[PDB]
């Protein structure tokens, strides 16, 4: 029936949101970042890395080595304090939406989520 | 039209709305239910932030969709 | 964020900056606080002479990092 159409659509909508929101591992609060470093401080007091989403205890989690502009760190593979994940997450969200709309076309002879 | 809203903690509530309603109006309903001041509310739907002056229909928010209340923080 | 610019005379300048500020912006801030024209400023960090068109984040400059200012004077 139409109930399955709703169930599929909302599951995609919630996956699209999961790609964007960072949930605090301590308290479960949904977070997003306006600007700044990737070291987040939740209102519960716990810190987290905005990139890998793990709980952390300070700036030691991140690569703190000098870098050459346009090059990755040659001393470690740690999360970067400065890189903005927005574009990568938007690309994931848009591929999910694109594929989902193609699936609903196959199923039901319509867009999902906000337009581009 | 019925939609859902998840609070900061993850508790889910239910609102009756219309797709022509504005984001401000939806925030007023959230205030009626949970007492959260609208200026403390920041809403996400399907990965996108909902902006004052827009309507639910601007973001293709349909029946049984879920809006998420989040904190917008500055990194260190 | 906040960084320190130390001179060869030992003086330490405190600057308020953002990771997206370019090195050209940082030298403008130095000109503002100390009156040194950018063309007289060489900024060095971990042995690298920082390029004006690049950002602080491009070099992975950290909060509370210290840069080193070496002066020059072509005009005489
Ligand atoms: Zn938390
Ligand atoms: Zn990380
Ligand atoms: Zn490193």
Swiss-Prot record, chain A:
Subcellular location: Cytoplasm; Cytoplasmic vesicle, Clathrin-coated vesicle
PTMs per UniProt: Auto-ubiquitinated. Phosphorylation at Ser-68 enhances acceptor ubiquitin binding and chain-type specificity towards 'Lys-63' di-ubiquitin but not di-ubiquitin with other linkage types.
Cross-link (Glycyl lysine isopeptide (Lys-Gly) (interchain with G-Cter in SUMO2)): 7, 15, 110
Zinc finger (RING-type) in chain: 24-52
Residues with Phosphoserine modification: 68
Active site, per annotation: 37
Residue numbers binding Zn(2+) 5: 49, 52, 65, 73
Superkingdom in the source lineage: Eukaryota
Disulfide pairings: none
Coiled coil: 86-109
Binding site for Zn(2+) 4: 24, 27, 42, 44
Tissue: Ubiquitous, with the highest levels of expression in testis and peripheral blood leukocytes.
Disease: Gordon Holmes syndrome: A disease characterized by cerebellar symptoms and signs of sex steroid deficiency. Clinical features include cerebellar and brain stem atrophy, cerebellar ataxia, hypothalamic LHRH deficiency, hypogonadotrophic hypogonadism, lack of secondary sexual characteristics, and infertility.
Subunit-structure text: Interacts with UBE2L3 and to some extent with UBE2L6. Interacts with TRAF3, TLR3, TLR4, TLR5 and TLR9. Isoform 3/ZIN binds RIPK1. (Microbial infection) Isoform 3/ZIN binds RIPK1 and HIV Vif.
Record note on domains: The RING-type zinc finger domain mediates binding to an E2 ubiquitin-conjugating enzyme.
Protein name (Swiss-Prot/TrEMBL): E3 ubiquitin-protein ligase RNF216
Organism: Homo sapiens
Lineage: Eukaryota, Metazoa, Chordata, Craniata, Vertebrata
Whole-protein coverage range: 652 to 771 of 866
UniProtKB/Swiss-Prot annotation, chains B, C:
Subcellular compartments: Cytoplasm; Nucleus; Mitochondrion outer membrane
Effect on the protein of changing residue 76 to D: Impairs ubiquitination by CRL2(KLHDC3) and CRL2(KLHDC10) E3 ligase complex
Superkingdom field: Eukaryota
Crosslinked residue numbers (Glycyl lysine isopeptide (Gly-Lys) (interchain with K-? in acceptor proteins)): 76
Effect of substituting residue 72 to A: Impairs ubiquitination by CRL2(KLHDC3) E3 ligase complex. Impairs ubiquitination by CRL2(KLHDC3) E3 ligase complex
Membrane association type: Peripheral membrane protein
Record note on what altering residue 9 to D does: Impairs ubiquitination by CRL2(KLHDC3) E3 ligase complex
Domain Ubiquitin-like: residue ranges: 1-76
Effect after changing residue 60 to R: Decreases affinity for UBE2R2 in CRL2(FEM1C)-UBE2R2 complex
Post-translational modification note: Phosphorylated at Ser-65 by PINK1 during mitophagy. Phosphorylated ubiquitin specifically binds and activates parkin (PRKN), triggering mitophagy. Phosphorylation does not affect E1-mediated E2 charging of ubiquitin but affects discharging of E2 enzymes to form polyubiquitin chains. It also affects deubiquitination by deubiquitinase enzymes such as USP30. Mono-ADP-ribosylated at the C-terminus by PARP9, a component of the PPAR9-DTX3L complex. ADP-ribosylation requires processing by E1 and E2 enzymes and prevents ubiquitin conjugation to substrates such as histones.
UniProt modified residues of type (Microbial infection) ADP-ribosylthreonine: 66
Cross-link Glycyl lysine isopeptide (Lys-Gly) (interchain with G-Cter in ubiquitin), where in sequence: 6, 11, 27, 29, 33, 48, 63
Site (Essential for function) residue list: 68
Annotated positions of the Phosphoserine modification: 65
Outcome, altering residue 65 to A: Prevents phosphorylation in case of mitophagy. Decreased localization of PRKN to mitochondria
Residues annotated with ADP-ribosylglycine modification: 76
Summary of the function given for this chain in its UniProt record: Exists either covalently attached to another protein, or free (unanchored). When covalently bound, it is conjugated to target proteins via an isopeptide bond either as a monomer (monoubiquitin), a polymer linked via different Lys residues of the ubiquitin (polyubiquitin chains) or a linear polymer linked via the initiator Met of the ubiquitin (linear polyubiquitin chains).
Protein name, entry field: Ubiquitin
Residues included from the entire protein: 1 to 76 of 685
